[model samples]
Structures are given as C-alpha cells and as structure tokens.
Target: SLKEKFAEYEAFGPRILELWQAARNAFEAGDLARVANLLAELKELFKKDLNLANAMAAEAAEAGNKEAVALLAEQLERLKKIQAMFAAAVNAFRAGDREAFGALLEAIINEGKALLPLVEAIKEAI
Candidate 1:
C-alpha cells in the first residue's frame, strides 16, 4: 500500500492541527494488521519527513526565530530517535528474533509512556 505517512506535512505540518483530525479517524478503526502495515510503511516514509523537518529547522534558525528553531530542533531529534527505534523493532521482527522484537515493542510502549511527561515538561519549560 502507498502510505501517506507525511500527508500532514503537505500543508499542515503542525502536530496538534493534524493530530486531532487524524486521531478522530483512527479512534474507531480497530484493524491491527492494517495499522501494523501502515506503521511499517511509515518507517520508510519518515526519511522524507525528517528531511523536510531539517529544512524547516534550518530556515527557522536562519531567520533568527529562536523559539521555532529550538522547538523544531527538539522535535526533529525526538522524531529521529523514534524512527530509529521503529526501524530496529521492524528489523528484529523480520529477522524472527521474537524475544528481541518483543523487547523492542515493549520499549516502544514504554517510550510512549515516558514521552508524555517529557512532552509536558517541554511544553512547560519552552
């Protein structure tokens, strides 16, 4: 399937602006296999996403918009880390390393749990 992983970036790359609409659509969908497939596809699409993000960060920093530069820089790093973890997890799964894959999945979930507080802190501090 041709996944539109970065569709939200086309015009509306702001996270909150895109997420509400997206979450609403996903809320009622309980199809795990398709979701997993999309997630797998996202691992590929994110390369472009990160590139676009870097461009934005550079533009913001060049324009002397310190807040945008700082915030976008943090977001870029966080997303890069996430992309790496997802890639690792997918590779482990494909390699048939069940234990490693399961651990990666657990790491993904725990990372999500940890990220909530981290995001809150960032929002507060920034």
Candidate 2:
C-alpha cells in the first residue's frame, strides 16, 4: 500500500516544481496577480501532497516499515514547512514587500530541491 500511495504522491511532484517555476516567472515579469493565482494553486497542490504523505506514513506504520515511516514523517514535516513558507511569501507579496517575498520563495525552491532526494530514497526503501 505504500507503493500505491506513492504512486499518487509521485504524480504531484513534477507539478509542484512546474507551479513554483511559473510563480517565479510571474513574479519576475511583474505579474503580481498571476503570481497570486499560481501561489494559490501551488498551495492546493501542496495540501494534496501532504494528505498523500500522511496516508503513506499511515500505511507504512500499519505494515511496520520503520524506515518508510521515518522517511514519510520527514517528507510530511518538510511539506508543512514549505506550506508555511508559501503562506509567508503570500503575505509578503500582499504587503508589497518584494524582497521578503523573493527570499521566501527562493528558500521554498531550495527546500523543494532538497526534498526530491528524500523522496527518491523513500522510493528505494519502500
């Protein structure tokens, strides 16, 4: 069931990056409205990803897969932090603090980059 759960979760991985890039592009182009919309969509994608991560964590626990469970918890925690970063970025954007928004978005992308390897490790472990 972990594999099955991962199947669904994996599908969203690329989409998250795509949305993040689009948001970044929008920001660069001074399309604040577009950036806002993309951020909303990105947040929604993250929410779905988080749910699947939780499901996978639960499945791993049920099967007594300690390694998978730990990886899933790490993934879940990262997702929560990324979600918070997005929220903070949105607030900064709304407040017209472009510097703060850019900083937070950059951090989110780096966090995302770090997350991919962890996901790959989970795939291998599971």
Candidate 3:
C-alpha cells in the first residue's frame, strides 16, 4: 500500500523542487509577478501532495499501521502549514511587502527541501 502511494509521489516529487527554485529565482530577480505565477502552479502541486499524503494515511490505516498513519498525518499537517505560508507569501507579494514575501518564500523553500527526507521516513514507518 505504501509502495502504491509512494509511486504517485515518485512521479510528482521532482516538480516540487523545480517549481520552488523557479519561484526563488523569480524572487531574487525582483519579479514578483513571476513569483506569483510560479506559486500559483505550486499551489496546485501542493493540493496534489496533500491528496497523496491523505491516500497514504488512509492506506496505512486500512493496513492497521497506526504509526505509519500518524507519521503520514503529521506530514499532512506540515504541508497544510506550508500551504498557509504560501498563502502569506502571496499576500505579502500582493501588498508589495518584499521583505515579508522573501522571508516566507525562503521558509517554504526550506520546508520543501525536507519533503524528500520526510518521505523516506514515511517509507521506514511503513
């Protein structure tokens, strides 16, 4: 079940970092509009990420792996927070607050970097 769920991520994961970098590059170049566009794409990807995590958690639950379920749930929750961060970054950009936008963007990028390792941990749990 975990294998099946992770298969979905394997297909989707690389784009996460690629888009994050695009957004970061846009931010560095003072291209707020581009950053906004990139983040919009990332928002869609994050929705899929959340769905995949939910699927994994459900699979774990059905398989009677409570620990795996908890781990997946925690990852899901973190993703929700990151989604909020993305929203804040978007708002900051909209309000023309470059400093806050950059900070939130960097934070989101850092969290995105951790995603792969977190997935690895999920594999171990499963």
Candidate 4:
C-alpha cells in the first residue's frame, strides 16, 4: 500500500507543480480560458490527492497511527480549502473583480508552496 501510494505521488506530484506554474502563466497573460484549463489539470491532481489522503488517513487509523491519521485529515482539509480558493479565483475573474482574483492567485501560490513539506511528510508517513 505504501509503495503504491508513493508511486502515484512520484508519477504526478511534479506534474502538479508544472500545472500550477502553467496556471499562473495563463492568469498573468489574462487568458481565462487557458487558466481554466490549467486549473482543471490541477483540480484533477487535487482530486487524486484527496482520494489518496482519505485512504491514507483511514489506513493510518487502522494501523493505530493517530498522528498520521490526523496529519492526513489535516492535509485533506487544506486541500479542500484550496479547491475552494481555486474556484473562487475563477469566479472572481468571471466577476471582473481583478483585486479579488489577484489576491486569490497569490493565496494559491502561497498555499501551494505550503503544501510541499506537508506532502513530503505525508509521503514519509505511509
């Protein structure tokens, strides 16, 4: 199970980073269409990550690793929160609210970076 999870992460984690950068580039270029597509890419990764996180959390719990379970749970929530932010960023752009969209973009970048160590820790946990 651990190997499977690690394999999955190894496959897509870096691509996720690329999609984030691509999304940022799209946004910077004011190409909402491209931005949407790029964000869609990231969303897929998020979806996969969420599913894995849930499974890992349960696995940790079953293994009596309370700390791992808690960490996984926290990661899931954080991922969910960013998903919301991603949606809001698109919505803000759709609403023609540059300020809000800009803020959301910055937030996503910051939060995305914040996930790095947590994800690494998560990987180590399993």
Give the best candidate by lDDT: 2
Clash pairs, model 4 backbone: none
Q: lDDT of model 2 at residue 111? A: 89
The clash numbers for all candidates, in the given order, read 0, 0, 0, 0
Query: Could you arrange the candidates by lDDT from highest to lowest?
Result: 2, 3, 4, 1
Local distance difference test values of all predictions, in order = 0.51, 0.86, 0.82, 0.75
Q: What are the per-residue Cα lDDT tens digits for candidate 1 across 1-126?
A: 011222333432333223322322332264445545555455545565667667766665666767656766676677667667778867765675656755765665554444344333323322
| Sequence-dependent TM-score of model 3 | 0.86
Q: Kindly list the per-residue Cα lDDT of model 4 for residues 1-126, writing each as its tens digit.
A: 854775675456566666777777887788989977877777778788767767767778888887677777877777788889988987887787878987887887777777767777766666
Clash tally for model 1: 0
Model 2 local distance difference test score = 0.86
Poorly placed runs, candidate 2 (over 4 Å): none
User: TM-score of model 1 relative to the true fold?
Assistant: 0.55
Write one digit per residue (lDDT tens) for candidate 2, span 45-123: 8888988899888888988999998988888889889888988988998898989988887899888888887888888
Badly placed stretches (over 4 Å) of model 1 are: 1-7, 10-36, 109-126
For model 3, what is the error of residue 69's alpha carbon versus the real structure, in angstroms, after optimal superposition? Answer: 0.9
For every candidate, C-alpha RMSD to the true structure in Å = 8.3, 1.2, 1.8, 2.1
lDDT of 2 at 36: 85
Displacement of residue 58 (Cα, Å) in model 3 is: 1.4
